[PDB]
Design a protein around this motif. Structure first.
Motif, PDB file in Angstrom:
ATOM      1  N   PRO A 177      -3.400   0.589  -3.037  1.00 31.21           N
ATOM      2  CA  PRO A 177      -2.671  -0.801  -2.979  1.00 31.21           C
ATOM      3  C   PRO A 177      -2.121  -0.970  -4.394  1.00 31.21           C
ATOM      4  CG  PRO A 177      -5.127  -0.605  -2.309  1.00 31.21           C
ATOM      5  CD  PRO A 177      -4.923   0.750  -3.154  1.00 31.21           C
ATOM      6  N   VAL A 195      -7.508  -4.262   3.374  1.00 36.32           N
ATOM      7  CA  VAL A 195      -7.221  -3.511   1.996  1.00 36.32           C
ATOM      8  C   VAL A 195      -8.519  -3.910   1.133  1.00 36.32           C
ATOM      9  CG1 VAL A 195      -5.972  -3.142  -0.206  1.00 36.32           C
ATOM     10  CG2 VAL A 195      -4.786  -3.807   2.056  1.00 36.32           C
ATOM     11  N   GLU A 198       0.984  -1.192   0.015  1.00 38.13           N
ATOM     12  CA  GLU A 198      -0.229   0.111  -0.093  1.00 38.13           C
ATOM     13  C   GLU A 198       0.759   1.033   0.005  1.00 38.13           C
ATOM     14  OE1 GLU A 198      -3.173  -1.222   3.007  1.00 38.13           O
ATOM     15  OE2 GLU A 198      -4.323  -0.029   1.647  1.00 38.13           O
ATOM     16  N   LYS A 217      -5.661   4.784   0.349  1.00 37.34           N
ATOM     17  CA  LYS A 217      -4.484   4.442   0.222  1.00 37.34           C
ATOM     18  C   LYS A 217      -4.434   3.742  -1.166  1.00 37.34           C
ATOM     19  CE  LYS A 217      -2.995   2.934   4.775  1.00 37.34           C
ATOM     20  NZ  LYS A 217      -2.880   1.886   5.568  1.00 37.34           N
TER      21      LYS A 217
END
Ligand code: FCO
Ligand code: F3S
Ligand code: F3S
Ligand code: F3S
Ligand code: F3S
Ligand code: F3S
Ligand code: F3S
Ligand SMILES: [Mg+2]
Ligand code: 3NI
Lengths: 513, 63, 322, 322
Positions: free
Chosen positions: A340, A460, A300, A338
């Motif tokens: 990924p 995630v 990430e 974020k």
């Protein structure tokens, strides 16, 4: 033309989309996840099972998926035993949540945009309005109303939906009775008959699942009036007429972590044995090639995210340290998502689109085991017409019949006299990886339990994969690249941005958690 | 009902709480407990007032 | 009756639960009960500037706002700016201020909005709070003295998420001229739903009465009550979860999951600290730290011993059998 | 799976309840679950000789009969001739003999068929009896040793009427290959429904636990349990009435009506003799004549006194408030 669209709703949370438009086409895009709750921060130091309570609250529509993967994160962390019935119940509930999501998202979140005035010139526009207008559409109302049935099945096994935590290390809390299973079957069959087959398909699920090529799908649309005038047939025809097959291509690279374990193959959940046990296969599809999913390849990046950090972090070492959005914007950060990225050999850390399309591509991978989803349909569609808003949506909708059949079989597979729970040892230490395919795609938990507490907890989510911002290499996230190339007929109502973002079934509460 | 009392006692038996075995406290009658109390009573008002001086002595013994 | 449904620090679970509504279902509520849903982030057609036009018209009084539903927490971080929740060009908390000041009725749906809920768990990175409560403490974001234009405080429909009926029946009552029938408890929750306990209608109360504990999950939940070993907060939690079943099917407790007391403002209780999740905290290994509402540890424990000794045989066997 | 549904001394309430089925609803059960409803007096298209042709083909084995559902009592009067129930040219009891002997599975739906029910109340003018029971006494019309062709005794789905799920879920189980999951209790009732008590899931069990009595009907039922003053048989009656709610809404006990113990073979209990209707028969004005199942008067009364002493304040107040 710099266009800032705020809010871009119907993405289950707070999304703003900035686009550069040249000659009526998006040339660059920024997705800005605008709302942060910090559940990963909250989970630190909490009870090792606190994820089972907190993670479902990452999202209302896919909390059951969160529960599923959080439970499996604990199962792997604690090296638990999963009785086959527990695996079946988990599969059933995950798939039922997805089966709820499919129509609920399609009608309530996506298809109402098909009534946009940009399509008024289409010969199908009046029918699109009749069917998909918000709250009054003749397809909208039954689709949305019946979307609650599969999660009735979820509630039968989990007590309620949303917000059960009944998936626990070692199995499930519940002990289904005969009437539970028979009622779940009845609910599922009624939903399948009344929405999936009658309204969505205009044919049996079996007939739809016979479609193995894009040409098969077109022939299916034209085969008879029932399929032609089904919501699926109408949607395909509408997409082809109005050009939803012409943009929203995106990265063309896909991540599926897979879900739905074959009960006999995941009785003792491990990270390493996860892929083989999957029914809905994992798989990375990058540069036109199939790769095995490996959670070790997941990083990430927070370069353009409102978090402190200077290098991509594998979520086992993940950190969620927010920076003030004012400061972050001074640093070029623009999203609470974020970024990924997945390390694909020969490609580096690339963005991967997650979601039903990713799953269908993974299901088209060779060497499927007998228990595994082996479906060449979307390999063929990808090679024939490539990704698009229409193809992404069709992948989502294609999962309806497939998952319905799987759930029906799993309900038959339940051995009601057998165990639903093996009491685990709640180890003071452990590293767990739980993953599932929520409706919107790869959802994964990396948990580190230390001293009988949550030492680290990194989630995630699929929309984080899709909508996460540019990484350190300035490589746009899947949704950002899908937005690029999108036509913009009306900057005042840039519905095509909504089409692209919602074709991913974007969930912004999941994106940020 | 006997099985109910058996399960109840069986839960009492798994007590799992602090427990200490100490058995000797002899020689209290020999102690002039009342006499020491008389010494303490005349001394209590002195001891309470002397607390800062007693602490300053103890502090020099903590080194 | 115009309804503006906003989401702050929400997971949209209350919306999804709401979408599970039956009798009325959500579509019939929105269309056939005269409730004009102006916008909802999960359902509104408008995006961007058209949506903002709707919001600004509601906030400035250009168009009437009868019901402002708020889901999710009021996010105030960072530093009270609320920029961890930016919505339609403003911190969401500013929207909350304007719209709560404009609405005839303000409804906080879900613990996040009512009391702060899960995002308000320590360390509360988002600076989350409820509309009129922070956990049990009255005041939240809008202050203890906030009243909507109809004179009501924020109507707290708690739960995580709220059951669809907890909001839909309130909306129907408002739409059918029965607003005056709505009484609120001290937490501003509708007493028509929150005078009962989760335990009320729980399929395991007979086991509770006889102090027969569920010992394990899965098939272990074919018998017993979850209070003693799984931290069931049923008897300390006001809710109609076992009266009005979830998804018209079940409830956590029926299914074998302990009630987490989510309708209570402290939820998640003990902030999910280690050892408190699906466990009953006990003193000396026998006495629950928390006894049912309105009871005292000595009378509870005495009655519990009496109930154990007089327990019937069926209370000590599986009852939710295949 | 062919189904022939006959009605003897029935009021058709089991059929009407069955028609209230949801998940599956009755139409989906009849069509989409592979259950070929050959005929039903309330629903069959055939009349007269065409209907009789269907019946005779089932009785003589010309066509398979998988499930014979019988509703209503087997009427034997007058003088064992059964002519108080003449159906399709025969005493209904003769049809019962033939079809029960032909069916793979025989299901008695409703107390009338299971145990004789209300028509079997004294003086029993119709000579009514159940298929395999007369009240609690095993044997009824078909004899204690009757077995259908699948080896099962008459499956007794009691109730007056049976709840739609009590039959529909059994039919679904049979249709989905889960016949082997069906276990029957000593009264041949499906244990998946009849291991619980009516009290199981009753919204008033907490009042029961604390021995707080509903004192009056109407608003008096906003509190209290009906056991003490209204003869609620909930704790003595096996049923899932409070687990699987009636009409997906409620149950007698939730609504404030005492359970009449209709799933029990003695129903109507005490033959509705004077003073037994909506009243708890008591010894010395305070000890109920009948205590909950598996309890004895001594322990029950001791625990009741203890509970009355321990009763929290909320258990003494209205809880099912407006
Ligand atoms: N589906 C879903 Fe939610 C997202 N993104 C998760 O996981
Ligand atoms: S359902 Fe979601 S919006 Fe808040 S009240 Fe619970 S975390
Ligand atoms: S009676 Fe039910 S509400 Fe909880 S305390 Fe026992 S499982
Ligand atoms: S956790 Fe909440 S949903 Fe009901 S069962 Fe307990 S009050
Ligand atoms: S409903 Fe009617 S058929 Fe008999 S079982 Fe009751 S009198
Ligand atoms: S608990 Fe309910 S079932 Fe009857 S005995 Fe009391 S009203
Ligand atoms: S009278 Fe019968 S329908 Fe249920 S509430 Fe009692 S067993
Ligand atoms: Mg994360
Ligand atoms: Ni989500």
């Amino acid at each position: 033309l710099d266009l800032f669209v705020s809010p871009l709703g119907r993405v289950e949370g707070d999304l703003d989309v900035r686009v550069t438009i040249n000659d009526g086409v998006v040339t660059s895009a920024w997705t800005e996840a605008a709302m942060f709750r910090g559940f990963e921060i909250i989970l630190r130091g909490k009870d090792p099972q606190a994820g089972l309570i907190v993670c479902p609250r990452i999202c209302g529509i896919c909390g059951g998926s969160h529960l599923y993967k959080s439970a499996y994160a604990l199962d792997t962390a604690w090296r638990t035993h999963m009785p086959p019935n527990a695996t079946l119940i988990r599969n059933i509930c995950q798939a039922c949540e997805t089966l709820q999501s499919i129509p609920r998202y399609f009608y309530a979140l996506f298809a109402i945009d098909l009534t946009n005035k940009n399509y008024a010139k289409s010969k199908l526009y009046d029918e699109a309005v009749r069917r998909f207008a918000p709250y009054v559409g003749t397809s909208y109302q039954p689709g949305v109303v019946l979307s609650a049935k599969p999660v009735e099945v979820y509630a039968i096994f989990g007590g309620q939906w949303p917000x059960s935590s009944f998936m626990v290390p070692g199995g499930v809390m519940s002990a289904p009775t005969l009437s539970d299973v028979t009622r779940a079957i009845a609910i599922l069959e009624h939903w399948n008959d009344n929405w999936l087959e009658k309204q969505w398909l205009g044919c049996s699920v079996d007939r739809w699942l016979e479609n193995k090529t894009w040409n098969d799908v077109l022939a299916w649309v034209d085969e008879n009036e029932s399929q032609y005038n089904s919501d699926c047939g109408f949607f395909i025809r509408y997409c082809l007429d109005v050009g939803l097959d012409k943009y929203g291509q995106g990265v063309g690279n896909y991540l599926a972590t897979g879900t739905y374990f074959e009960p006999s193959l995941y009785e003792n959940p491990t990270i390493e044995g996860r892929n083989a046990a999957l029914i809905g296969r994992s798989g990375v599809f990058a540069d036109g090639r199939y790769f095995e999913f490996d959670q070790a390849n997941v990083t990430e990046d927070v370069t353009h995210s409102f978090y402190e950090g200077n290098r991509p972090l594998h979520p086992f070492e993940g950190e969620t340290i927010p920076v003030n959005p004012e400061d972050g914007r001074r640093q070029g950060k623009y999203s609470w998502a974020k970024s990924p990225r997945y390390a694909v050999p020969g490609l580096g850390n690339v963005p991967l689109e997650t979601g039903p399309l990713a799953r269908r591509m993974a299901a088209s991978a060779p060497d499927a085991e007998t228990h595994q989803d082996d479906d060449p349909l979307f390999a063929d569609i990808y090679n024939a017409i490539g990704p698009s808003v229409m193809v992404r949506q069709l992948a989502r909708m294609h999962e309806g019949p497939k998952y319905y059949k799987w759930v029906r079989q799993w309900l038959d597979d339940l051995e009601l006299k057998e165990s639903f729970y093996t009491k685990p040892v709640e180890y003071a230490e452990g590293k767990g990886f739980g993953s599932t395919e929520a409706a919107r795609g790869a959802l994964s938990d990396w948990i580190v339990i230390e001293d009988s507490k949550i030492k680290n907890y990194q989630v995630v989510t699929p929309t984080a994969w899709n909508i996460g911002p540019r990484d350190a290499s300035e490589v746009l996230g899947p949704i950002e690249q899908a937005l690029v190339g999108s036509p913009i007929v009306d900057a005042e109502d840039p519905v095509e941005l909504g089409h692209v973002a919602r074709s991913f079934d974007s969930c912004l509460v999941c994106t940020v958690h | 009902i006997a099985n109910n009392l058996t399960s109840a006692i069986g839960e009492l038996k798994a007590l799992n709480a602090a427990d200490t075995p100490i058995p000797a406290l002899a020689a209290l009658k020999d102690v002039d407990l009342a006499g020491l109390a008389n010494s303490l009573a005349t001394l209590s008002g002195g001891l309470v007032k002397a607390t800062p001086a007693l602490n300053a002595v103890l502090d020099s013994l903590t080194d | 009756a115009s309804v503006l449904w906003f989401q702050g620090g929400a997971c949209s679970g209350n919306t999804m639960s709401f979408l599970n509504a039956d009798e009325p279902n959500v579509v019939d509520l929105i269309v056939d009960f005269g409730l004009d849903l102006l916008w909802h982030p999960s359902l509104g057609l408008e995006l961007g500037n058209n949506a903002q036009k709707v919001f600004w018209d509601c906030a400035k009084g250009e168009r009437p706002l009868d019901i402002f539903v708020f889901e999710g927490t009021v996010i105030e971080a960072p530093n009270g700016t609320g920029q961890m929740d930016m919505f339609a060009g403003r911190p969401m908390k500013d929207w909350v201020t304007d719209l709560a000041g404009a609405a005839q009725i303000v409804v906080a749906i879900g613990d996040c909005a009512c009391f702060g809920g899960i995002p308000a768990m320590e360390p509360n990175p988002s600076g989350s709070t409820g509309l009129q409560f922070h956990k049990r403490e009255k005041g939240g974001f809008l202050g203890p003295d906030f009243r909507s234009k109809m004179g009501l405080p924020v109507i707290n429909v708690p739960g995580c998420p709220a059951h669809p009926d907890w909001i839909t029946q309130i909306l129907v009552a408002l739409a059918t001229g029965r607003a005056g029938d709505i009484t609120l408890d001290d937490l501003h929750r509708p007493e028509t739903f929150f005078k009962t306990f989760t335990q009320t209608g729980c399929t395991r109360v007979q086991f509770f009465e006889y102090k027969q504990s569920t010992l394990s999950f899965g098939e272990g939940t074919r018998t017993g009550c979850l209070f003693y070993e799984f931290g069931c907060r049923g008897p300390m939690t006001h809710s109609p979860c076992n009266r009005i079943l979830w998804n018209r099917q079940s409830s956590k407790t029926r299914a074998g999951m302990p009630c987490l007391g989510c309708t209570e403002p402290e939820f998640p209780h003990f902030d999910l600290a280690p050892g408190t999740v699906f466990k009953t905290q006990k003193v000396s290994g026998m006495i629950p730290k928390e006894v049912p509402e309105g009871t005292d540890h000595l009378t509870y424990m005495g009655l519990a011993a009496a109930a154990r000794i007089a327990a019937p045989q069926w209370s000590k066997e599986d009852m939710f059998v295949v």
